[PDB]
Design a protein around this ligand. Sequence first.
Ligand SMILES: [Ca+2]
Ligand SMILES: [Ca+2]
Ligand SMILES: [Ca+2]
Ligand SMILES: [Ca+2]
Ligand SMILES: [Mn+2]
Ligand SMILES: [Mn+2]
Ligand SMILES: [Mn+2]
Ligand SMILES: [Mn+2]
Lengths: 232, 232, 232, 232
Amino acid sequence: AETVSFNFNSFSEGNPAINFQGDVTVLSNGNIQLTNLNKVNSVGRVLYAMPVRIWSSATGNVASFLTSFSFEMKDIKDYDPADGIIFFIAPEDTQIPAGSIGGGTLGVSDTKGAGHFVGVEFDTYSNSEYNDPPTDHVGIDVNSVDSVKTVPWNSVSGAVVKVTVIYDSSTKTLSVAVTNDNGDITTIAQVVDLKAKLPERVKFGFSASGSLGGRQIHLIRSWSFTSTLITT
Amino acid sequence: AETVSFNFNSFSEGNPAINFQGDVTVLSNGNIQLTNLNKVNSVGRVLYAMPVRIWSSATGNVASFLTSFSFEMKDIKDYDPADGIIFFIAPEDTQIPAGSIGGGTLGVSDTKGAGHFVGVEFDTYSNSEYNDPPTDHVGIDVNSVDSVKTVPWNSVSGAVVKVTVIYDSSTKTLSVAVTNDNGDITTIAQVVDLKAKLPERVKFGFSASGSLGGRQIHLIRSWSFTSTLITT
Amino acid sequence: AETVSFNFNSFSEGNPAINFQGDVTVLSNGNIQLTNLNKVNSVGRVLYAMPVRIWSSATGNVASFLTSFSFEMKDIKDYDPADGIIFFIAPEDTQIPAGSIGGGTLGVSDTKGAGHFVGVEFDTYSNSEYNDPPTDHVGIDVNSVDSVKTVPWNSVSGAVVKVTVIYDSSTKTLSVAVTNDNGDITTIAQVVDLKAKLPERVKFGFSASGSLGGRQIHLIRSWSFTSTLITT
Amino acid sequence: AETVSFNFNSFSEGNPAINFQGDVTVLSNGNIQLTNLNKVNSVGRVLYAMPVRIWSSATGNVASFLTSFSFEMKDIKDYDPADGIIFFIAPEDTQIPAGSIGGGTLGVSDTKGAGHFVGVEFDTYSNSEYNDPPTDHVGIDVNSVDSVKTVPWNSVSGAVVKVTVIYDSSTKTLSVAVTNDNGDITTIAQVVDLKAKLPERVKFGFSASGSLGGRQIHLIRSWSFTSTLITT
Ligand SMILES: [Ca+2]
Ligand SMILES: [Ca+2]
Ligand SMILES: [Ca+2]
Ligand SMILES: [Ca+2]
Ligand SMILES: [Mn+2]
Ligand SMILES: [Mn+2]
Ligand SMILES: [Mn+2]
Ligand SMILES: [Mn+2]
């Protein structure tokens, strides 16, 4: 039983348990603001500093993990509410794509929307070049922002959104449950073999981005995580 | 968007929001004691009073729900810890089987261990006649306590256990993440078409049962639930 | 090396190992409820029946001890939490102060908040008459609930708290580590010359109290204890 | 409220949370054997891979931590049982001192027995050059294997030893509670300003050394830890 577990009710600069990339910033109240409102094509990513072993090439086993986080997106006069936030898993050498154009790539893909990652996005701007549905949505991404699956969702400015994710290694199922301000929940699940798409050791994080005309406040308020690899 | 959501940090006799059945009692702190230790073959169930609609015959849609609860199981001199607790879903008229023999039936099945229900069991006693794994386990039960699927588990006497469940209607997947006292998680997932195994309107709840030589303390400490059915 | 060591994972009236004083009552799950919610200025105390020799006048040696225990405090409409629990050490003949007014005396002191004891209080209601801090707090008490030193704490209703106390006779240091539900730890330590404040033989126990308007549920879930006295 | 917490009931090579230094080896049963029996001056160290911030220069606050771990030492024919284990805290860049001669340096000090670290040793070999007591002992080391304080102890071969450490930030007290196989406890405590002796970011870990004629099996059976730094 190999278990990595952490809980964040707030954040602060200096904590060695978390890595910042790009235009990330910690607010006095302890929240993480992922993008910068004055930069064009902004990109902000926050990662748990320590890599986590999600599978052993020895036991062949794959870990299960339970994580939940709360975020908030808020409009600002008078740019378009873009582009959203993404909870991702990637190789430990994961950096903000070079020459990132931000926007629809969400800071995890190249200009074509390709990359090495597995994630859950909370997309609030429609990008046709990536085949986005016409409305706000939640999608499961596997090496591309061209979601492997999506579900209609509604991003309510200033609302605090609570998310719960469960990965069952046995069925290799990734289930997501989103709790909107109104109390309604949105779910989405997709079978993804983490052992076949990611390396033994990976990192977990949040990413968000904007464009020239599209910018909003992307806030990460809290994050608790727990993985458990069976060794034997 | 039809949603049902409730949250109990503690219970109490009376509250018409929860129908009791059997040897159920309420401790001083609001904890529910599903069974009685001075009674042979005891059964006790607790149900959310108001029935819930998990699917529509018109729309065809099945509801998605997110539920979490924390229970505790403690041993008693010198008796055997059995059998345990089951989170279940059944027809709005559900009742403790006629002539319930308690024990392995968990208060939801008959002698053969069959019944009209869906649920997750935290089985602590192994009944070979029900093809029970040799050790403590967690199982996805569909109309039978002879689990559709099980996973090795460890029940620790006196430890507060936390459970989170997510049912994604899009995939008909039922995900379970069990957080143990020591922080390790156990998961199990199973595709279960509720729409096919249950009526449009059901009731959610907990059930536990002891036998003659097998009795233990089963307590429910909290329960929050949210189901959402799309009506469009 | 004289060693006294015991473990209590569940309690049960009748056990000659425990002395019950006041309004104490054992729940059916094995928990000890210290206060009566239907009584004004209630007081309850549970004590290890066998007096423990912490020091000897013959050698001048003082014993070191290690002890851990878990409690649970929960609210009750619309009353105010009062007043909390206190782990205390005292003369083997200790009884509840005659004419106990309940309140912030925790059942170990008189109206002026004075008594003959040493303990760790987990104060939830602030009493200006006892120089209490404005918020919930943990404190080291020496013959008075007018703590020799307190520390900011946060009592969370329905939450299981873990405490570990270490007394080093060589330094006469009493150390307390409090594990909250969220995983945060709270500590407080202080030099207390036991040999100079209590008789050679004393009793160890917990006590809780409520008042007229302030009442809550105080539960002791477990308790393990080990002291070693050097004889040479 | 910043908090780091991990828990190991067993260990396995490959876990990125653990850093191995020296002759460290993981046994088939999940234990960590710190030294190499066929090697002269064998030195083995295991550290928690993630640096911990024990104090911020911003607020000037020191963290509090509660740790506990079980270890075991076993004699090997007919070599002398040496030298023991040390639980230490050093700079995040800490490495086995070049030209480490092992033995009484315990793998954290130079020839003179000096280095940059704070720790608790379980010394089973008297080294007059470092002023060790004539017998097995436990000591609080502050930048030197010439303990600032010791207490008589007794290493029993094959015996599992359970230790619990508490470091209260308010008093800057480091308290240790050692529970021997037979059930007797040994405590030692010392005031130590971790903010005056170490940098803001450090690493925790265990070290073990041997000599030419002094060798034995040093095992770390399990380790749990929780630090909490109040950033407010
Ligand atoms: Ca997009
Ligand atoms: Ca069974
Ligand atoms: Ca008070
Ligand atoms: Ca030595
Ligand atoms: Mn998209
Ligand atoms: Mn079963
Ligand atoms: Mn007080
Ligand atoms: Mn020494």
